[PDB]
């Protein structure tokens, strides 16, 4: 019970392994939902 | 996170950018004053203007454009017009003294002291951009200031922003209709200078556009404004793929890799359709097969050359409206089967197809009529050699006895600058002959 | 059910934190454009004089 | 509206969720 | 138990997966909000095959979506049935390869694939015991095909004992859609052959032909094509997730549809497909099922199957039906067309039966077969590639980003050898 | 019974504590004014670990806020939870250090430390049996580091048997906050390693990697950033205040994390930290807890943890969770990834459990490991220091207050030797 067993009745828990992603491996976008939701308002401009 | 920046030079450039901007603004839904209409209340949204506008945080929206010219009247008129509150006040760098149709003047005399401001502004506007795709340039050949400034801009951009894709919408003079008496010289010089830096350029010779306008719209007294409207619609059709939803997309980056058979031959010509005025548009059914057939028809090719006079090697066309792949392939099969339009031996398929939904917005007070389907095509065909063939003859005759050479020599250009350009054109002349010959 | 009790309460205060700042900035932004209208006119008013 | 290009127009038409196993059930017990 | 993961690439792959996931969600009864609303118990017995368990019981498809261009993804996240996907697995780029295989496989993909590999490893390890993969990708697009093929070798280098598929749509010259399709398809197939365990090519031209001639709908649409593709995919893996007469997982078909190591291309078709008016004058009968299934025009590969012989053919007759009848019909069809079944391998058809039918049909069958006729597409692709390469057309682009002409020279020879070895067995006799 | 006291200095140090007491204050339910409103008794059983008693029932947090300038300490007073601090416990000068260690440890720091030391000797003896001291400071500050590195030196002089602790933040080379960062950074480390038994480092630059990617909040703020560090505060001292399966006080962790006396630098981590928008899809499970728990992107430090190996690892879980699953899941981490675990020491991870969890969630884990990857923190630090010493740049400020050029040289050599000796075991084999 501390390893791998072969019977559908008793499952085998996963054993995770480390990845190889650098601290700055690009990727971004998809900002639809965000904590702040940057402020936007509507103010009429003068006629100059 | 997709955007593009338009670099413009030359009075024709400014007056075409005007119309293209009214088209694009009316298409996204921004009034001229720059304030979103209080009734619409778009609210939380993205895209739309981003691909061509940058959020100011709140309120107005600055069109991501820069205007540069050496002549003051057009800039002053644009600033004082009804679009004053739209553009940045200081991004319209305008000079003082006219270049006066002297290409040499536009390249070494009164361009170096202002290209610096042009590049500084372009850099500042770019740094804020985070998803730069490429550039668009509109510049004339038959204008000295325009040609010189455009040459300088392209040369600097080749050294500032790397392999970023760039597109050039030049304008060449018609086979018989002319506006100046010194067009050929600046035409040849600009061709030489721009050959090895512009990836893509499409012909827009004026006489053909005159022909289409007369033939279809049935309007007998056109003016430069209508041609500008047609050109702006052409740009809109070309670029609509990047900002509206669609079942099949193509980007600006996916043009310079699909219509340039060789690194050297990168000149192609485009056409638009359908072009039917509202007075009679609806009598025909509003025949996708007939519309596609008209797309290839010799008369409406926006550049004065005979497609029948040359082979086809690359034909890229975009569809918008209620287009459907069923009609697309039904028409494509017939066009391909056609014999009168033949294809080069080593181009089994020269079709890149993109499908888009949003119909072309019809502007009030114009000639464009409401439609449901449109077809816009960008084609690089062996017939392109004709324009350069005619220009060469127009050049050697003049050069035979040093006509007008005095002012160009007196502007700092060395004597031999013309011969090298002629040699480059001849080498280009040889290439089209070589590529077009079957095995 | 209680497992949801603490999580909902904690998120409540934090959101009030998100609301307090945003409501703070929004009022200032009202100030930001407010002045500009008050200054352009003065330049406009002086023009006639 | 863009619904005329969005969803499919295919039609293919209740107590059909019994396994083939459910044929075995009940059947009560029956000189010189 | 024996769950699988989904990884789609390119715009075509994203749309195809979007339709497939909608079909799967409908078949298992999961609403867009992710709350179970089924009817019978069996709909939840093996739901673990494709979904994952989370707090509150809202099930999330275990799909990974990759693309170098954002518009398609930002569109697919807002349409119908788009809120089931985990936002975590969305990993993507911005610039794109621009229909350039070299750009999509060397310069940008090399940078982008790290995160995608990390996430795919995370999910695959998280599953109970990975059974295999499924990758659907469009060979005709450069930015897609590049990364799509690269990830194939990347995964196959770490999961040698696992089984993997490849749903591919290849561009025919008549239905041409890209000018660089010759180049990208040839380069892609070069790598696909060497590592992909299974491949099932489908032709857009044949799809259109079927949609018009059979369905008789006034106007087809991309959704119309996607729905057929998704129905075929659902048939491809139906029996793995329901009670059945004779279970046949991926490995069984893998063994029973591969004569030699280097032939891993089949063709598929879904039946019945009847005109809305023909849905009631028709009789859903066992002989009709097999007849329509072996009719040539139903295949989604534009090549005419009859131009040669089959090596192996297996079917998954879904729903409750006959067994005597399946066996006898298989015998009758194998005899009546003796010349069209290769002679040296007797009993050259496989039979599979599952009970649960589709929601809306009582009898339906998915056909998978590896036939010599596929050589037509490869031969046409080779001819088109030669006609262009011999003149150095569009050559400088793929050479300006590090790929040298030596690789191009190597790939063509391998493709030609594959074609020759595939044709040789046509003339083989015992 | 085995209580500890807080000794903090510096605006960076003050803020960390200022938010530190807020998070702890809610743990046992102490109101902002000190009025008790707790619900469960367990919140009141072990309150002595951090609080004293006084008439009126209002509780006092035994803290000693120290800084050489009035601006920072006068700030926490007016805000919430600052009223708790006893007015008599504030000791502060009036001159300012100017980020000059010379002004912060020799001339000004010594003069004021007399009074502050007095209060330190005051509260500590009051408790029944002092357990140890925990001090938070900044290595990149002038006024802070001087006293911070100095007060610790004398404190260790009177209480040799006490357990020592210090939580630190070090300046990454990428985004530098102090132009004199190299000096006050490397100069301090020499003294800290001399007496402090334990020491931790959290990299600000690594923190932003926590925010911009994990939390997915567009506008991180110093109010937000402090929260993460505060959580790690309760990560270590957690089980010391509640019942549990296997209690693990501060000193026990020391017995299982330091192979030799001269390696007392660790990197910490906290999980699960999930963005607000994605919180519904994930499913809380200890295995999922661990993978993100060992994820390369969860460590708050700048050192890449895949570039070395772990000498020892620590785990301090939270909540009613199965004892085995920690054990079974903990071992697999040392087998599937053997390459990253040293080979001469077996079964190199310890674990512990606390049955009362942090507020709001159901499971939590605190990460503590002595990893050889931390070498890259100083080599980069040393590289800048050596580059900045050859020309005697910025030498006059420090040397003008009694410190001679010889002292720097001793500091560098000690730093350099530690760099080499740290990696001696990395290449060592059994
Ligand atoms: N399509 C179009 N072409 C124009 C228009 N105006 C001028 N041109 C073309 O431009 C050529 C002359 O150059 P312009 O663009 O007018 O002037 P420019 O670009 O400012 O350069 P300079 O004349 O040196 O100042 C003429 O031969 C015309 O063919 C216009 O309104 N529409
Ligand atoms: N049948 C079908 N094919 C599609 C669909 N979407 C894309 N494709 C195929 O994808 C090809 C174009 O690929 P492309 O979009 O450039 O791929 P990408 O460059 O990786 O994004 C075309 O040849 C189409 O055959 C679809 O909805 N249905
Ligand atoms: N995370 C975090 N870091 C801080 C905070 N305040 C200061 N720091 C760090 O402390 C460093 C400056 O230390 P300093 O205040 O000059 O120390 P001093 O000598 O005691 O004044 C900067 O590099 C900051 O990164 C804070 O509120 N949060
Ligand atoms: Mg002009």
PDB file of N, CA and C and ligand atoms in Angstrom, chain B residues 9-16 69-71 74 98-102 139-147 171-174 177-180 183 186 204-206 209-210 223-225 227-228 231, ligand 1:
ATOM      1  N   UNK B   9       3.829  59.514 -46.204  1.00  0.00           N
ATOM      2  CA  UNK B   9       4.616  60.616 -46.738  1.00  0.00           C
ATOM      3  C   UNK B   9       4.049  60.997 -48.097  1.00  0.00           C
ATOM      4  N   UNK B  10       3.973  62.290 -48.363  1.00  0.00           N
ATOM      5  CA  UNK B  10       3.509  62.779 -49.645  1.00  0.00           C
ATOM      6  C   UNK B  10       2.050  63.196 -49.611  1.00  0.00           C
ATOM      7  N   UNK B  11       1.740  64.266 -50.348  1.00  0.00           N
ATOM      8  CA  UNK B  11       0.389  64.818 -50.316  1.00  0.00           C
ATOM      9  C   UNK B  11      -0.646  63.762 -50.674  1.00  0.00           C
ATOM     10  N   UNK B  12      -0.360  62.952 -51.691  1.00  0.00           N
ATOM     11  CA  UNK B  12      -1.238  61.837 -51.986  1.00  0.00           C
ATOM     12  C   UNK B  12      -1.384  60.910 -50.798  1.00  0.00           C
ATOM     13  N   UNK B  13      -0.285  60.671 -50.086  1.00  0.00           N
ATOM     14  CA  UNK B  13      -0.364  59.841 -48.899  1.00  0.00           C
ATOM     15  C   UNK B  13      -1.314  60.410 -47.866  1.00  0.00           C
ATOM     16  N   UNK B  14      -1.195  61.708 -47.588  1.00  0.00           N
ATOM     17  CA  UNK B  14      -2.065  62.316 -46.587  1.00  0.00           C
ATOM     18  C   UNK B  14      -3.518  62.253 -47.032  1.00  0.00           C
ATOM     19  N   UNK B  15      -3.784  62.584 -48.295  1.00  0.00           N
ATOM     20  CA  UNK B  15      -5.170  62.626 -48.746  1.00  0.00           C
ATOM     21  C   UNK B  15      -5.783  61.238 -48.868  1.00  0.00           C
ATOM     22  N   UNK B  16      -4.966  60.194 -48.992  1.00  0.00           N
ATOM     23  CA  UNK B  16      -5.514  58.843 -48.957  1.00  0.00           C
ATOM     24  C   UNK B  16      -5.703  58.385 -47.519  1.00  0.00           C
ATOM     25  N   UNK B  69       5.258  65.330 -43.819  1.00  0.00           N
ATOM     26  CA  UNK B  69       5.293  65.954 -45.133  1.00  0.00           C
ATOM     27  C   UNK B  69       6.230  67.148 -45.081  1.00  0.00           C
ATOM     28  N   UNK B  70       6.752  67.508 -46.249  1.00  0.00           N
ATOM     29  CA  UNK B  70       7.546  68.716 -46.387  1.00  0.00           C
ATOM     30  C   UNK B  70       6.740  69.895 -46.911  1.00  0.00           C
ATOM     31  N   UNK B  71       5.421  69.745 -47.066  1.00  0.00           N
ATOM     32  CA  UNK B  71       4.601  70.839 -47.559  1.00  0.00           C
ATOM     33  C   UNK B  71       3.558  71.221 -46.514  1.00  0.00           C
ATOM     34  N   UNK B  74      -1.391  71.011 -46.778  1.00  0.00           N
ATOM     35  CA  UNK B  74      -2.211  69.852 -46.450  1.00  0.00           C
ATOM     36  C   UNK B  74      -2.252  69.633 -44.944  1.00  0.00           C
ATOM     37  N   UNK B  98       9.015  73.597 -49.509  1.00  0.00           N
ATOM     38  CA  UNK B  98       8.638  72.501 -50.387  1.00  0.00           C
ATOM     39  C   UNK B  98       9.864  71.882 -51.046  1.00  0.00           C
ATOM     40  N   UNK B  99       9.786  70.572 -51.282  1.00  0.00           N
ATOM     41  CA  UNK B  99      10.855  69.886 -51.995  1.00  0.00           C
ATOM     42  C   UNK B  99      10.809  70.180 -53.486  1.00  0.00           C
ATOM     43  N   UNK B 100       9.619  70.415 -54.033  1.00  0.00           N
ATOM     44  CA  UNK B 100       9.461  70.844 -55.419  1.00  0.00           C
ATOM     45  C   UNK B 100       9.934  69.767 -56.399  1.00  0.00           C
ATOM     46  N   UNK B 101       9.328  68.593 -56.281  1.00  0.00           N
ATOM     47  CA  UNK B 101       9.419  67.532 -57.277  1.00  0.00           C
ATOM     48  C   UNK B 101      10.848  67.101 -57.564  1.00  0.00           C
ATOM     49  N   UNK B 102      11.813  67.561 -56.782  1.00  0.00           N
ATOM     50  CA  UNK B 102      13.208  67.181 -56.959  1.00  0.00           C
ATOM     51  C   UNK B 102      13.513  66.012 -56.030  1.00  0.00           C
ATOM     52  N   UNK B 139       3.070  56.269 -50.141  1.00  0.00           N
ATOM     53  CA  UNK B 139       3.947  57.312 -50.653  1.00  0.00           C
ATOM     54  C   UNK B 139       3.905  57.285 -52.170  1.00  0.00           C
ATOM     55  N   UNK B 140       4.054  58.458 -52.776  1.00  0.00           N
ATOM     56  CA  UNK B 140       3.964  58.578 -54.223  1.00  0.00           C
ATOM     57  C   UNK B 140       5.340  58.443 -54.862  1.00  0.00           C
ATOM     58  N   UNK B 141       5.346  58.108 -56.150  1.00  0.00           N
ATOM     59  CA  UNK B 141       6.603  58.017 -56.879  1.00  0.00           C
ATOM     60  C   UNK B 141       6.890  59.320 -57.611  1.00  0.00           C
ATOM     61  N   UNK B 142       5.851  59.976 -58.123  1.00  0.00           N
ATOM     62  CA  UNK B 142       6.025  61.146 -58.961  1.00  0.00           C
ATOM     63  C   UNK B 142       6.213  62.444 -58.203  1.00  0.00           C
ATOM     64  N   UNK B 143       6.420  62.352 -56.893  1.00  0.00           N
ATOM     65  CA  UNK B 143       6.682  63.529 -56.088  1.00  0.00           C
ATOM     66  C   UNK B 143       8.046  63.454 -55.439  1.00  0.00           C
ATOM     67  N   UNK B 144       8.862  64.494 -55.616  1.00  0.00           N
ATOM     68  CA  UNK B 144      10.225  64.441 -55.110  1.00  0.00           C
ATOM     69  C   UNK B 144      10.287  64.302 -53.602  1.00  0.00           C
ATOM     70  N   UNK B 145       9.534  65.143 -52.888  1.00  0.00           N
ATOM     71  CA  UNK B 145       9.546  65.082 -51.431  1.00  0.00           C
ATOM     72  C   UNK B 145       9.042  63.734 -50.942  1.00  0.00           C
ATOM     73  N   UNK B 146       7.938  63.261 -51.515  1.00  0.00           N
ATOM     74  CA  UNK B 146       7.404  61.979 -51.097  1.00  0.00           C
ATOM     75  C   UNK B 146       8.390  60.853 -51.323  1.00  0.00           C
ATOM     76  N   UNK B 147       8.990  60.808 -52.514  1.00  0.00           N
ATOM     77  CA  UNK B 147       9.923  59.736 -52.825  1.00  0.00           C
ATOM     78  C   UNK B 147      11.123  59.775 -51.895  1.00  0.00           C
ATOM     79  N   UNK B 171       2.517  54.320 -55.576  1.00  0.00           N
ATOM     80  CA  UNK B 171       1.627  54.805 -56.629  1.00  0.00           C
ATOM     81  C   UNK B 171       2.489  55.208 -57.819  1.00  0.00           C
ATOM     82  N   UNK B 172       2.288  54.552 -58.963  1.00  0.00           N
ATOM     83  CA  UNK B 172       3.088  54.827 -60.146  1.00  0.00           C
ATOM     84  C   UNK B 172       2.258  55.519 -61.215  1.00  0.00           C
ATOM     85  N   UNK B 173       2.904  56.191 -62.163  1.00  0.00           N
ATOM     86  CA  UNK B 173       2.160  56.961 -63.159  1.00  0.00           C
ATOM     87  C   UNK B 173       1.627  56.087 -64.281  1.00  0.00           C
ATOM     88  N   UNK B 174       0.496  56.522 -64.833  1.00  0.00           N
ATOM     89  CA  UNK B 174      -0.231  55.738 -65.816  1.00  0.00           C
ATOM     90  C   UNK B 174       0.520  55.687 -67.142  1.00  0.00           C
ATOM     91  N   UNK B 177      -1.643  58.767 -69.096  1.00  0.00           N
ATOM     92  CA  UNK B 177      -2.053  59.903 -68.278  1.00  0.00           C
ATOM     93  C   UNK B 177      -0.910  60.284 -67.351  1.00  0.00           C
ATOM     94  N   UNK B 178      -0.529  61.557 -67.375  1.00  0.00           N
ATOM     95  CA  UNK B 178       0.591  62.037 -66.586  1.00  0.00           C
ATOM     96  C   UNK B 178       0.211  63.337 -65.901  1.00  0.00           C
ATOM     97  N   UNK B 179       0.895  63.625 -64.797  1.00  0.00           N
ATOM     98  CA  UNK B 179       0.662  64.847 -64.041  1.00  0.00           C
ATOM     99  C   UNK B 179       1.853  65.788 -64.051  1.00  0.00           C
ATOM    100  N   UNK B 180       3.058  65.264 -64.189  1.00  0.00           N
ATOM    101  CA  UNK B 180       4.263  66.070 -64.227  1.00  0.00           C
ATOM    102  C   UNK B 180       5.033  65.784 -65.511  1.00  0.00           C
ATOM    103  N   UNK B 183       8.348  62.983 -64.063  1.00  0.00           N
ATOM    104  CA  UNK B 183       8.007  61.797 -63.286  1.00  0.00           C
ATOM    105  C   UNK B 183       8.999  60.657 -63.493  1.00  0.00           C
ATOM    106  N   UNK B 186      12.309  60.453 -61.002  1.00  0.00           N
ATOM    107  CA  UNK B 186      12.031  60.078 -59.627  1.00  0.00           C
ATOM    108  C   UNK B 186      11.449  58.677 -59.556  1.00  0.00           C
ATOM    109  N   UNK B 204      -1.023  51.033 -58.010  1.00  0.00           N
ATOM    110  CA  UNK B 204      -2.255  51.811 -57.956  1.00  0.00           C
ATOM    111  C   UNK B 204      -2.251  52.906 -59.016  1.00  0.00           C
ATOM    112  N   UNK B 205      -1.856  52.563 -60.240  1.00  0.00           N
ATOM    113  CA  UNK B 205      -1.791  53.554 -61.308  1.00  0.00           C
ATOM    114  C   UNK B 205      -3.151  54.213 -61.526  1.00  0.00           C
ATOM    115  N   UNK B 206      -3.125  55.527 -61.741  1.00  0.00           N
ATOM    116  CA  UNK B 206      -4.350  56.315 -61.691  1.00  0.00           C
ATOM    117  C   UNK B 206      -5.284  56.026 -62.858  1.00  0.00           C
ATOM    118  N   UNK B 209      -7.805  53.166 -62.461  1.00  0.00           N
ATOM    119  CA  UNK B 209      -8.861  53.508 -61.516  1.00  0.00           C
ATOM    120  C   UNK B 209      -9.872  54.425 -62.180  1.00  0.00           C
ATOM    121  N   UNK B 210      -9.390  55.403 -62.946  1.00  0.00           N
ATOM    122  CA  UNK B 210     -10.302  56.233 -63.723  1.00  0.00           C
ATOM    123  C   UNK B 210     -11.201  55.362 -64.592  1.00  0.00           C
ATOM    124  N   UNK B 223     -13.402  62.810 -59.292  1.00  0.00           N
ATOM    125  CA  UNK B 223     -12.325  63.631 -58.762  1.00  0.00           C
ATOM    126  C   UNK B 223     -11.439  62.770 -57.874  1.00  0.00           C
ATOM    127  N   UNK B 224     -10.323  63.349 -57.429  1.00  0.00           N
ATOM    128  CA  UNK B 224      -9.349  62.560 -56.684  1.00  0.00           C
ATOM    129  C   UNK B 224      -9.970  61.934 -55.444  1.00  0.00           C
ATOM    130  N   UNK B 225     -11.024  62.549 -54.912  1.00  0.00           N
ATOM    131  CA  UNK B 225     -11.628  62.047 -53.687  1.00  0.00           C
ATOM    132  C   UNK B 225     -12.209  60.653 -53.884  1.00  0.00           C
ATOM    133  N   UNK B 227     -11.272  58.344 -56.032  1.00  0.00           N
ATOM    134  CA  UNK B 227     -10.168  57.398 -56.085  1.00  0.00           C
ATOM    135  C   UNK B 227      -9.642  57.112 -54.688  1.00  0.00           C
ATOM    136  N   UNK B 228      -9.535  58.148 -53.854  1.00  0.00           N
ATOM    137  CA  UNK B 228      -9.091  57.925 -52.483  1.00  0.00           C
ATOM    138  C   UNK B 228     -10.063  57.028 -51.731  1.00  0.00           C
ATOM    139  N   UNK B 231      -9.441  53.482 -52.812  1.00  0.00           N
ATOM    140  CA  UNK B 231      -8.201  52.972 -52.240  1.00  0.00           C
ATOM    141  C   UNK B 231      -8.400  52.620 -50.773  1.00  0.00           C
TER     142      UNK B 231
HETATM  143  N1  LIG G   1      -4.643  58.674 -56.363  1.00  0.00           N
HETATM  144  C1  LIG G   1      -4.259  59.936 -56.207  1.00  0.00           C
HETATM  145  N2  LIG G   1      -3.036  60.345 -56.688  1.00  0.00           N
HETATM  146  C2  LIG G   1      -2.642  61.627 -56.529  1.00  0.00           C
HETATM  147  C3  LIG G   1      -3.462  62.535 -55.888  1.00  0.00           C
HETATM  148  N3  LIG G   1      -2.836  63.727 -55.864  1.00  0.00           N
HETATM  149  C4  LIG G   1      -1.642  63.596 -56.475  1.00  0.00           C
HETATM  150  N4  LIG G   1      -1.509  62.303 -56.896  1.00  0.00           N
HETATM  151  C5  LIG G   1      -0.348  61.751 -57.602  1.00  0.00           C
HETATM  152  O1  LIG G   1       0.835  62.289 -57.051  1.00  0.00           O
HETATM  153  C6  LIG G   1       1.727  62.670 -58.070  1.00  0.00           C
HETATM  154  C7  LIG G   1       2.518  63.895 -57.638  1.00  0.00           C
HETATM  155  O2  LIG G   1       2.924  63.760 -56.295  1.00  0.00           O
HETATM  156  P1  LIG G   1       1.946  64.249 -55.117  1.00  0.00           P
HETATM  157  O3  LIG G   1       1.484  63.081 -54.280  1.00  0.00           O
HETATM  158  O4  LIG G   1       0.771  64.978 -55.723  1.00  0.00           O
HETATM  159  O5  LIG G   1       2.812  65.289 -54.248  1.00  0.00           O
HETATM  160  P2  LIG G   1       3.662  64.829 -52.965  1.00  0.00           P
HETATM  161  O6  LIG G   1       3.422  63.382 -52.612  1.00  0.00           O
HETATM  162  O7  LIG G   1       3.348  65.750 -51.816  1.00  0.00           O
HETATM  163  O8  LIG G   1       5.171  65.078 -53.434  1.00  0.00           O
HETATM  164  P3  LIG G   1       5.522  66.554 -53.939  1.00  0.00           P
HETATM  165  O9  LIG G   1       4.678  66.830 -55.155  1.00  0.00           O
HETATM  166  O10 LIG G   1       6.990  66.642 -54.276  1.00  0.00           O
HETATM  167  O11 LIG G   1       5.168  67.544 -52.859  1.00  0.00           O
HETATM  168  C8  LIG G   1       0.870  62.966 -59.283  1.00  0.00           C
HETATM  169  O12 LIG G   1       1.490  62.489 -60.452  1.00  0.00           O
HETATM  170  C9  LIG G   1      -0.414  62.208 -59.044  1.00  0.00           C
HETATM  171  O13 LIG G   1      -0.488  61.093 -59.898  1.00  0.00           O
HETATM  172  C10 LIG G   1      -4.685  62.131 -55.399  1.00  0.00           C
HETATM  173  O14 LIG G   1      -5.414  62.938 -54.834  1.00  0.00           O
HETATM  174  N5  LIG G   1      -5.085  60.828 -55.564  1.00  0.00           N
END
